[PDB]
Amino acid sequence: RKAVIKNADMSEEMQQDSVECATQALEKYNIEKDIAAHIKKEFDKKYNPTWHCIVGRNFGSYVTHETKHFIYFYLGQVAILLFKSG
Template sequence: MERLTVTIISADMHEDIQQKAVEITVTAIEKYTIEKDIAAYIKMEFDKYYHPTWHCIVGKHFGSYVTHELNCFIYFYVKNVAILLYKCD
């Protein structure tokens, strides 16, 4: 199995939850090839573990400006794919 490079760009999230985000994302990337499916998997897992409502954007080219709950935001890369994950009710 290939070791994936992870780079956290910005986070307002406890370190243990950041680690869970990375683990779930790696699993999603191993299971799916379509970015929409990767995002859906990450979102559903976070809704399950950390209660709704999480939002996830996955891709190589996107801009964003979001409002999020305290301690519920992470923006990171796995290889060359960006993941934006945040909670907002």
């Protein structure tokens, strides 16, 4: 659904790809775990490992990211957190 980016430490091109990738994952899967798995795997392939992705409706997080590889955004009511670390 509607993509809203709240925070980002990421280039403009990677930001759009993160949203697009999550959007496709959300279209294909209903289960958040499987949505996250799609998003993570695609990023490892295109932008090198190691990415991590969390998708959900209710959580708080405190994580560490590599510069230029973190985004936090919503698709409707579902939040997606994606970053590299390691």
